[PDB]
């Protein structure tokens, strides 16, 4: 038995949860904050759990179910999973991330050459920083002597900040010491919604 | 409240009947006193409406020992059919919920005590039995 | 209800996970286990009351074995033949039953959550490299999780962005932590990151300078 939630990302609003087989109202909802434990909200699509605020409502039956919320309090921005508890096996779905919405902020791009302490170990790492940008969607593309780089870069996005509700990204490009000395130009191209033109930040070995 | 349930379930025949006790998933004596040590699961006495019977002593004091002590029994005569599951997984009846030889009084354990009634149709019943209006569901063919 | 401690084991082995129960009846409620990969959804790996009923999931039915053994209400959990994708946090939650519960089975209460990491790499101390100019420290080649980073012994808590760890191709981890400061105070204030890899007890204080 399979489950699927319709909204991939979210920014009154509702969340959908569609099944593959028919179920006569035996679905549960859960709320999970990043770092804490999942919390039960509704346990039979209609009746909410005791202690859950009345603003959390649930409707739907059969193949499609809905989780309806009206007021968005600061204690509600988290991931929400739906569970099927009719027959075995119990199955969840890909949780919907409810993100905040704000003014589109432009990313602050910074690039960092590898340190000389690391070059003495036979490997090099180049970092391109993106600080405080909205939304989470970004696009980083490395270039070495105007040559496309893919497969050796690994990214990591932080959670949405609490003071300004912005994201931050840091892409790491790992090269060998030998191949790092074979080139002199290293660039980091960034494409974001808060930028009318692809801002480029580059440097030379020197 | 939940302590008034006889859980003397000893699946010696290895039939695994307790599986349908926890979740949902084929080929007449009157109700009196029955010991709780030979009962596994809730007891449902069937008036016009299905009523759950708890575990008490010989006088009727509600005992909270899960039917472990021998002083735990069920007073089926005080609710004047009743059904229950014994220790080895048999639907022991007396009088059960078969008001009509083709129908059956519905209750949260209709499919566990009577598995061959899953394909039965439910109907809404309203009737003044002895002046009291009872609302319940049936399960006919 | 409290689980066991976090364990880290190499692939192709077995992990024994414990749990406990307090404030409810152990026979009635079934005890389930839930898996959550880092950055992914919740997996339904299942349940067992001490009545002797067990129903595993299709994928985990081969190697996962959940035993009740209501000696002190443990509800053990043994997962043999581990693999790299089994690296996930595991929970011990209460799933309801059609006896006392309103429906078949709902996870009304969950466990603290135990982290289980499956990797062939051994415990290795980190190597901090400076990101000279915004500036930061680059923690590279450390195992296993976690690693704590602070600046000036915690005296600088504004504008600090500690990025989550990344699993490299070599099985080791790599983490970055940057901080934004005005250029007028670049040659005035001294910035030092405080990296502490407690699994290896490797405390590092790196002074970051430009040029």
Coordinates of N, CA and C in Angstrom, one line a residue, chain A:
Chain A
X1 N 0.8 -1.2 0.0 CA 0.0 0.0 0.0 C 0.9 1.2 0.0
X2 N 0.5 2.2 -0.9 CA 1.4 3.4 -1.1 C 0.6 4.7 -0.8
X3 N 1.4 5.7 -0.3 CA 0.9 7.0 0.0 C 1.7 8.0 -0.8
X4 N 1.1 9.2 -1.0 CA 1.7 10.3 -1.7 C 1.0 11.6 -1.3
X5 N 1.9 12.6 -1.0 CA 1.4 13.9 -0.6 C 1.6 14.8 -1.9
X6 N 0.6 15.7 -2.1 CA 0.6 16.5 -3.3 C 1.6 17.6 -3.2
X7 N 1.5 18.5 -2.2 CA 2.4 19.7 -2.2 C 3.8 19.3 -1.8
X8 N 4.8 19.4 -2.8 CA 6.2 19.1 -2.5 C 6.8 20.1 -1.5
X9 N 6.6 21.4 -1.8 CA 7.1 22.4 -0.9 C 6.0 23.5 -0.7
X10 N 5.9 24.1 0.4 CA 4.9 25.1 0.8 C 5.6 26.3 1.3
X11 N 5.0 27.5 0.8 CA 5.5 28.8 1.2 C 4.4 29.8 1.4
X12 N -4.4 30.9 5.5 CA -5.0 29.6 5.3 C -4.4 28.8 4.2
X13 N -4.0 27.5 4.5 CA -3.4 26.6 3.5 C -3.6 25.2 3.9
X14 N -3.7 24.3 3.0 CA -4.0 22.9 3.2 C -2.9 22.0 2.6
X15 N -2.8 20.8 3.1 CA -1.9 19.7 2.6 C -2.7 18.5 2.2
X16 N -2.4 17.9 1.0 CA -3.1 16.8 0.5 C -2.3 15.5 0.7
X17 N -3.0 14.4 0.8 CA -2.4 13.1 1.1 C -3.3 12.1 0.3
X18 N -2.8 11.6 -0.8 CA -3.5 10.6 -1.7 C -2.9 9.2 -1.5
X19 N -3.8 8.2 -1.5 CA -3.4 6.8 -1.4 C -3.5 6.2 -2.8
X20 N -3.0 4.9 -2.9 CA -3.1 4.1 -4.1 C -4.4 3.2 -4.0
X21 N -4.7 2.6 -2.9 CA -5.8 1.8 -2.7 C -6.9 2.6 -1.9
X22 N -8.1 2.1 -1.9 CA -9.2 2.8 -1.2 C -9.1 2.5 0.3
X23 N -9.4 3.5 1.1 CA -9.4 3.4 2.6 C -10.6 4.2 3.1
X24 N -11.4 3.5 3.9 CA -12.6 4.2 4.5 C -12.3 4.9 5.8
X25 N -11.6 6.0 5.6 CA -11.3 7.0 6.7 C -10.6 6.3 7.8
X26 N -9.3 6.0 7.6 CA -8.4 5.5 8.6 C -7.0 6.0 8.4
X27 N -6.9 7.4 8.3 CA -5.7 8.1 8.1 C -5.3 9.0 9.3
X28 N -4.0 9.1 9.6 CA -3.6 9.9 10.7 C -2.6 10.9 10.1
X29 N -2.5 12.1 10.8 CA -1.6 13.2 10.5 C -0.6 13.3 11.6
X30 N 0.6 13.8 11.3 CA 1.6 14.0 12.3 C 2.4 15.3 11.9
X31 N 2.9 15.9 13.0 CA 3.8 17.1 12.8 C 5.1 16.9 13.4
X32 N 6.2 17.1 12.6 CA 7.6 16.9 13.1 C 8.3 18.2 12.8
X33 N 8.9 18.8 13.9 CA 9.9 19.9 13.7 C 11.3 19.4 13.6
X34 N 12.1 20.1 12.8 CA 13.5 19.6 12.6 C 14.3 19.6 13.9
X35 N 14.6 18.5 14.4 CA 15.4 18.3 15.6 C 14.6 17.7 16.8
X36 N 13.2 17.8 16.7 CA 12.4 17.2 17.7 C 11.7 15.9 17.3
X37 N 10.7 15.5 18.0 CA 10.0 14.2 17.8 C 8.7 14.4 17.0
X38 N 8.3 13.5 16.2 CA 7.0 13.7 15.6 C 5.8 13.7 16.6
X39 N 4.8 14.5 16.3 CA 3.7 14.7 17.2 C 2.4 14.4 16.5
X40 N 1.5 13.7 17.1 CA 0.2 13.3 16.5 C -0.7 14.5 16.5
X41 N -1.4 14.7 15.4 CA -2.4 15.8 15.3 C -3.8 15.2 15.1
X42 N -4.0 14.5 14.1 CA -5.3 13.8 13.8 C -5.1 12.3 13.6
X43 N -5.9 11.5 14.2 CA -5.7 10.1 14.2 C -6.8 9.3 13.4
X44 N -7.8 9.9 12.9 CA -8.8 9.3 12.0 C -9.4 10.2 11.0
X45 N -8.5 11.0 10.4 CA -8.8 12.0 9.3 C -9.8 13.1 9.8
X46 N -10.7 12.8 10.8 CA -11.6 13.8 11.2 C -11.3 14.2 12.7
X47 N -11.3 13.3 13.6 CA -11.1 13.6 15.0 C -9.7 14.0 15.3
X48 N -9.5 15.2 15.9 CA -8.2 15.6 16.3 C -7.7 15.0 17.6
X49 N -6.4 15.0 17.9 CA -5.9 14.5 19.1 C -6.1 15.5 20.2
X50 N -6.4 14.9 21.4 CA -6.7 15.8 22.6 C -5.4 16.6 22.9
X51 N -5.6 17.9 23.0 CA -4.5 18.8 23.2 C -4.0 19.6 22.0
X52 N -4.4 19.1 20.8 CA -4.1 19.8 19.5 C -5.0 21.0 19.4
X53 N -4.5 22.2 19.0 CA -5.3 23.4 18.8 C -6.4 23.1 17.8
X54 N -7.6 23.7 18.0 CA -8.7 23.5 17.2 C -8.6 24.1 15.8
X55 N -7.6 24.9 15.6 CA -7.3 25.4 14.2 C -6.8 24.4 13.3
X56 N -6.4 23.2 13.8 CA -5.9 22.1 12.9 C -7.1 21.2 12.6
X57 N -7.6 21.3 11.3 CA -8.8 20.5 10.9 C -8.3 19.5 9.8
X58 N -9.1 18.5 9.7 CA -8.9 17.5 8.7 C -10.1 17.0 8.0
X59 N -10.1 16.8 6.7 CA -11.2 16.4 5.9 C -10.8 15.4 4.9
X60 N -11.7 14.7 4.2 CA -11.4 13.8 3.2 C -11.7 12.4 3.6
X61 N -12.0 11.5 2.6 CA -12.2 10.1 2.8 C -12.1 9.4 1.4
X62 N -11.8 8.1 1.5 CA -11.6 7.3 0.3 C -10.1 7.2 -0.1
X63 N -9.8 7.8 -1.2 CA -8.5 7.8 -1.8 C -7.7 9.1 -1.5
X64 N -8.4 10.2 -1.3 CA -7.7 11.5 -1.0 C -8.2 12.1 0.3
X65 N -7.2 12.6 1.0 CA -7.5 13.2 2.3 C -6.8 14.6 2.3
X66 N -7.3 15.5 3.2 CA -6.8 16.8 3.3 C -6.6 17.2 4.8
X67 N -5.6 18.0 5.0 CA -5.3 18.6 6.3 C -5.4 20.1 6.2
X68 N -6.5 20.7 6.8 CA -6.8 22.1 6.6 C -6.4 22.8 7.9
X69 N -5.6 23.9 7.7 CA -5.2 24.8 8.8 C -5.5 26.2 8.3
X70 N -5.9 27.1 9.2 CA -6.3 28.4 8.8 C -5.3 29.4 9.4
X71 N -5.1 29.5 10.7 CA -4.2 30.4 11.3 C -2.8 29.8 11.3
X72 N -1.8 30.6 10.9 CA -0.4 30.1 10.8 C 0.4 30.8 12.0
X73 N 0.4 30.1 13.1 CA 1.2 30.6 14.3 C 2.6 30.3 14.1
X74 N 3.5 31.0 14.8 CA 5.0 30.6 14.8 C 5.3 29.2 15.2
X75 N 4.4 28.6 16.0 CA 4.6 27.2 16.4 C 4.1 26.1 15.4
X76 N 3.9 26.5 14.2 CA 3.3 25.6 13.2 C 4.2 25.3 12.0
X77 N 5.2 26.1 11.7 CA 6.1 25.9 10.6 C 7.0 24.7 10.8
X78 N 6.6 23.6 10.3 CA 7.3 22.4 10.4 C 6.9 21.4 9.3
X79 N 7.4 20.2 9.3 CA 7.1 19.2 8.3 C 5.9 18.4 8.8
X80 N 5.0 18.0 7.9 CA 3.8 17.3 8.3 C 3.7 16.0 7.5
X81 N 3.6 14.8 8.1 CA 3.5 13.5 7.5 C 2.1 12.9 7.8
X82 N 1.5 12.2 6.8 CA 0.3 11.5 6.9 C 0.6 10.0 7.0
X83 N -0.2 9.3 7.8 CA 0.0 7.9 8.0 C -1.3 7.1 7.6
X84 N -1.1 5.9 7.1 CA -2.2 5.0 6.8 C -2.2 3.9 7.8
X85 N -3.3 3.8 8.6 CA -3.4 2.8 9.7 C -4.6 1.9 9.5
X86 N -5.0 1.7 8.3 CA -6.1 0.7 8.1 C -5.6 -0.7 8.1
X87 N -4.8 -1.1 7.2 CA -4.3 -2.5 7.1 C -2.7 -2.4 7.1
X88 N -2.1 -3.6 7.3 CA -0.7 -3.7 7.3 C -0.2 -3.8 5.8
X89 N 1.0 -3.2 5.5 CA 1.8 -2.5 6.5 C 1.4 -1.0 6.6
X90 N 1.6 -0.4 7.8 CA 1.4 1.0 7.9 C 2.4 1.7 7.1
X91 N 2.0 2.8 6.4 CA 2.8 3.5 5.5 C 2.6 5.0 5.7
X92 N 3.7 5.8 5.6 CA 3.7 7.2 5.7 C 3.9 7.8 4.3
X93 N 4.1 9.1 4.2 CA 4.3 9.8 3.0 C 5.5 10.8 3.1
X94 N 6.0 11.2 1.9 CA 7.0 12.3 1.9 C 6.4 13.6 2.5
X95 N 6.9 14.0 3.7 CA 6.3 15.1 4.4 C 6.5 16.4 3.6
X96 N 5.4 17.2 3.8 CA 5.4 18.5 3.2 C 6.1 19.6 4.1
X97 N 7.0 20.3 3.6 CA 7.8 21.3 4.3 C 7.0 22.6 4.2
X98 N 6.5 23.2 5.3 CA 5.8 24.4 5.4 C 6.9 25.5 5.7
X99 N 7.2 26.3 4.7 CA 8.3 27.3 4.8 C 7.6 28.7 5.0
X100 N 8.4 29.6 5.6 CA 8.0 31.0 5.7 C 8.2 31.7 4.4
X101 N 7.5 32.8 4.2 CA 7.6 33.7 3.0 C 7.9 35.1 3.5
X102 N 8.8 35.7 2.7 CA 9.3 37.1 3.1 C 9.7 37.8 1.8
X103 N 10.4 38.9 2.0 CA 10.9 39.7 0.8 C 12.0 38.9 0.2
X104 N 12.1 38.8 -1.1 CA 13.1 38.1 -1.9 C 14.4 38.8 -1.6
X105 N 15.3 38.2 -0.9 CA 16.6 38.7 -0.5 C 17.7 38.2 -1.5
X106 N 18.6 39.1 -1.8 CA 19.7 38.7 -2.8 C 20.8 38.0 -2.0
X107 N 21.4 36.9 -2.5 CA 22.4 36.2 -1.8 C 23.7 37.0 -1.9
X108 N 24.5 36.9 -0.8 CA 25.8 37.5 -0.7 C 26.8 36.4 -1.0
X109 N 27.4 36.5 -2.2 CA 28.3 35.5 -2.7 C 29.7 35.8 -2.2
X110 N 30.4 34.8 -1.7 CA 31.8 34.8 -1.3 C 32.5 33.5 -1.7
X111 N 33.7 33.6 -2.1 CA 34.5 32.5 -2.5 C 35.8 32.4 -1.7
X112 N 36.3 31.2 -1.4 CA 37.4 31.0 -0.5 C 38.4 30.1 -1.1
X113 N 39.6 30.5 -1.4 CA 40.6 29.6 -2.0 C 41.0 28.6 -1.0
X114 N 41.6 27.5 -1.4 CA 42.1 26.5 -0.4 C 43.3 27.0 0.4
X115 N 43.4 26.6 1.6 CA 44.4 27.0 2.5 C 45.7 26.3 2.3
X116 N 46.8 27.0 2.5 CA 48.2 26.4 2.3 C 48.4 25.3 3.2
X117 N 47.8 25.3 4.4 CA 47.9 24.1 5.3 C 47.3 22.9 4.7
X118 N 46.2 23.0 3.9 CA 45.6 21.9 3.3 C 46.4 21.4 2.0
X119 N 47.0 22.3 1.3 CA 47.8 22.0 0.1 C 49.0 21.1 0.5
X120 N 49.5 21.2 1.7 CA 50.6 20.3 2.1 C 50.2 18.9 2.4
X121 N 48.9 18.6 2.3 CA 48.3 17.2 2.5 C 48.0 16.5 1.2
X122 N 48.2 17.1 0.0 CA 47.9 16.5 -1.2 C 46.5 16.7 -1.8
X123 N 45.7 17.5 -1.1 CA 44.3 17.7 -1.6 C 43.9 19.1 -1.4
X124 N 43.0 19.6 -2.1 CA 42.5 21.0 -2.0 C 41.0 21.1 -2.1
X125 N 40.5 22.1 -1.4 CA 39.0 22.3 -1.3 C 38.7 23.8 -1.5
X126 N 37.8 24.1 -2.4 CA 37.4 25.4 -2.7 C 35.9 25.6 -2.3
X127 N 35.6 26.7 -1.6 CA 34.3 26.9 -1.0 C 33.7 28.2 -1.6
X128 N 32.4 28.1 -1.9 CA 31.7 29.2 -2.4 C 30.5 29.4 -1.5
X129 N 30.4 30.6 -0.9 CA 29.4 30.9 0.2 C 28.3 31.7 -0.4
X130 N 27.1 31.3 0.0 CA 25.8 32.0 -0.2 C 25.2 32.3 1.1
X131 N 25.0 33.5 1.5 CA 24.5 33.9 2.8 C 23.2 34.7 2.7
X132 N 22.2 34.3 3.5 CA 20.9 35.0 3.6 C 20.3 35.3 2.3
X133 N 19.6 34.3 1.7 CA 18.9 34.4 0.4 C 17.5 33.7 0.5
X134 N 16.5 34.2 -0.2 CA 15.2 33.6 -0.2 C 14.7 33.7 -1.7
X135 N 14.1 32.6 -2.2 CA 13.8 31.4 -1.4 C 15.0 30.4 -1.4
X136 N 14.7 29.2 -0.9 CA 15.7 28.1 -0.8 C 16.3 27.7 -2.1
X137 N 15.5 27.9 -3.2 CA 16.0 27.4 -4.5 C 17.2 28.3 -5.0
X138 N 18.3 27.6 -5.3 CA 19.4 28.3 -5.8 C 20.1 27.4 -6.9
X139 N 21.2 27.9 -7.5 CA 21.9 27.1 -8.5 C 23.3 27.5 -8.6
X140 N 24.2 26.6 -8.2 CA 25.7 26.9 -8.2 C 26.3 26.0 -9.3
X141 N 27.2 26.7 -10.0 CA 27.9 26.0 -11.1 C 29.4 26.4 -11.1
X142 N 30.3 25.5 -10.8 CA 31.7 25.8 -10.7 C 32.3 25.8 -12.1
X143 N 33.4 26.6 -12.3 CA 34.1 26.7 -13.5 C 35.6 26.9 -13.2
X144 N 36.5 26.1 -13.8 CA 37.9 26.2 -13.6 C 38.5 26.4 -15.0
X145 N 39.1 27.6 -15.2 CA 39.6 28.0 -16.5 C 38.5 27.9 -17.6
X146 N 37.3 28.3 -17.2 CA 36.1 28.3 -18.1 C 35.8 26.8 -18.5
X147 N 35.8 25.9 -17.6 CA 35.5 24.5 -17.8 C 34.5 24.1 -16.8
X148 N 33.4 23.4 -17.3 CA 32.3 23.0 -16.4 C 32.8 22.0 -15.4
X149 N 32.3 22.1 -14.2 CA 32.6 21.1 -13.1 C 31.3 20.5 -12.6
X150 N 31.3 19.2 -12.5 CA 30.2 18.5 -12.0 C 30.6 17.1 -11.5
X151 N 30.1 16.7 -10.4 CA 30.4 15.4 -9.8 C 31.3 15.5 -8.6
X152 N 32.1 16.6 -8.5 CA 33.1 16.8 -7.4 C 32.6 17.8 -6.4
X153 N 31.5 18.5 -6.7 CA 31.0 19.5 -5.8 C 29.8 19.0 -4.9
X154 N 29.9 19.3 -3.6 CA 28.8 18.9 -2.7 C 28.3 20.1 -1.9
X155 N 27.0 20.2 -1.8 CA 26.4 21.4 -1.2 C 25.8 21.0 0.1
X156 N 25.4 22.1 0.9 CA 24.8 21.9 2.2 C 24.1 23.2 2.5
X157 N 22.8 23.1 2.7 CA 21.9 24.2 3.0 C 21.5 24.2 4.4
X158 N 21.6 25.4 5.1 CA 21.2 25.5 6.5 C 19.7 25.6 6.6
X159 N 19.1 25.4 7.8 CA 17.7 25.7 8.0 C 17.4 27.1 8.0
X160 N 16.1 27.5 7.8 CA 15.7 28.8 7.8 C 16.0 29.6 9.1
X161 N 16.7 30.7 9.0 CA 17.1 31.4 10.2 C 15.9 31.9 11.0
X162 N 16.2 32.2 12.2 CA 15.2 32.7 13.1 C 15.1 34.2 13.2
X163 N 16.2 34.9 12.9 CA 16.2 36.4 13.0 C 15.6 37.0 11.7
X164 N 15.9 36.4 10.6 CA 15.4 37.0 9.3 C 14.8 36.0 8.4
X165 N 14.7 34.7 8.7 CA 14.0 33.7 8.0 C 14.6 33.6 6.6
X166 N 15.9 33.4 6.5 CA 16.7 33.3 5.3 C 17.5 32.0 5.3
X167 N 17.9 31.6 4.1 CA 18.7 30.4 4.0 C 20.2 30.7 3.6
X168 N 21.0 29.7 3.8 CA 22.4 29.9 3.5 C 23.0 28.6 2.9
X169 N 23.8 28.8 1.9 CA 24.3 27.6 1.1 C 25.9 27.8 1.0
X170 N 26.5 26.6 1.1 CA 28.0 26.6 1.0 C 28.4 25.4 0.2
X171 N 28.9 25.6 -1.1 CA 29.3 24.5 -2.0 C 30.8 24.3 -1.8
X172 N 31.2 23.0 -1.7 CA 32.5 22.6 -1.5 C 33.0 21.9 -2.8
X173 N 34.1 22.4 -3.4 CA 34.7 21.8 -4.6 C 36.0 21.1 -4.2
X174 N 36.1 19.8 -4.3 CA 37.3 19.1 -3.8 C 38.1 18.7 -5.1
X175 N 39.3 19.2 -5.1 CA 40.3 18.9 -6.2 C 41.5 18.3 -5.6
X176 N 42.3 17.7 -6.4 CA 43.6 17.2 -6.0 C 44.7 18.3 -6.0
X177 N 45.7 18.1 -5.3 CA 46.8 19.1 -5.3 C 47.4 19.3 -6.6
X178 N 47.6 18.2 -7.4 CA 48.2 18.2 -8.7 C 47.3 19.0 -9.6
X179 N 46.1 18.7 -9.8 CA 45.2 19.4 -10.7 C 44.9 20.8 -10.3
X180 N 45.0 21.1 -9.0 CA 44.8 22.5 -8.5 C 45.9 23.4 -9.0
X181 N 47.2 22.9 -9.1 CA 48.3 23.7 -9.6 C 48.3 23.8 -11.1
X182 N 47.6 23.0 -11.8 CA 47.6 23.0 -13.3 C 46.7 24.1 -13.9
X183 N 46.0 24.8 -13.0 CA 45.1 25.9 -13.5 C 45.2 27.1 -12.6
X184 N 44.9 28.3 -13.1 CA 45.1 29.5 -12.4 C 43.8 30.3 -12.2
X185 N 42.7 29.9 -12.9 CA 41.4 30.7 -12.8 C 40.4 29.8 -12.2
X186 N 39.7 30.2 -11.1 CA 38.6 29.5 -10.4 C 37.5 30.4 -10.2
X187 N 36.3 30.0 -10.7 CA 35.1 30.9 -10.6 C 33.9 30.1 -10.0
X188 N 33.0 30.9 -9.5 CA 31.7 30.3 -8.9 C 30.6 31.2 -9.5
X189 N 29.7 30.5 -10.3 CA 28.6 31.2 -10.9 C 27.3 30.8 -10.1
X190 N 26.6 31.9 -9.8 CA 25.4 31.7 -8.9 C 24.2 32.2 -9.7
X191 N 23.1 31.5 -9.7 CA 21.8 31.9 -10.3 C 20.7 31.8 -9.2
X192 N 20.1 33.0 -8.9 CA 19.1 33.0 -7.9 C 18.0 34.0 -8.3
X193 N 16.8 33.8 -7.7 CA 15.6 34.6 -8.1 C 15.9 36.1 -7.7
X194 N 16.6 36.4 -6.6 CA 16.8 37.7 -6.2 C 17.9 38.4 -6.9
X195 N 18.3 37.9 -8.1 CA 19.4 38.4 -8.9 C 18.9 38.5 -10.3
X196 N 19.0 39.7 -10.9 CA 18.6 39.9 -12.3 C 19.6 39.4 -13.3
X197 N 20.9 39.2 -12.8 CA 22.0 38.7 -13.7 C 22.8 37.7 -12.9
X198 N 23.3 36.6 -13.5 CA 24.1 35.6 -12.8 C 25.4 36.3 -12.3
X199 N 25.4 36.5 -11.0 CA 26.6 37.1 -10.4 C 27.7 36.1 -10.3
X200 N 28.9 36.5 -10.7 CA 30.1 35.6 -10.7 C 31.1 36.2 -9.7
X201 N 31.7 35.3 -8.9 CA 32.8 35.6 -8.0 C 33.9 34.7 -8.3
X202 N 35.1 35.2 -8.7 CA 36.2 34.4 -9.1 C 37.5 35.0 -8.5
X203 N 38.6 34.2 -8.7 CA 39.9 34.6 -8.2 C 41.0 33.9 -9.0
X204 N 42.2 34.4 -8.9 CA 43.4 33.8 -9.4 C 44.3 33.3 -8.3
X205 N 45.1 32.3 -8.6 CA 46.1 31.8 -7.7 C 47.2 32.8 -7.5
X206 N 47.1 33.7 -6.5 CA 48.1 34.7 -6.2 C 47.6 35.7 -5.2

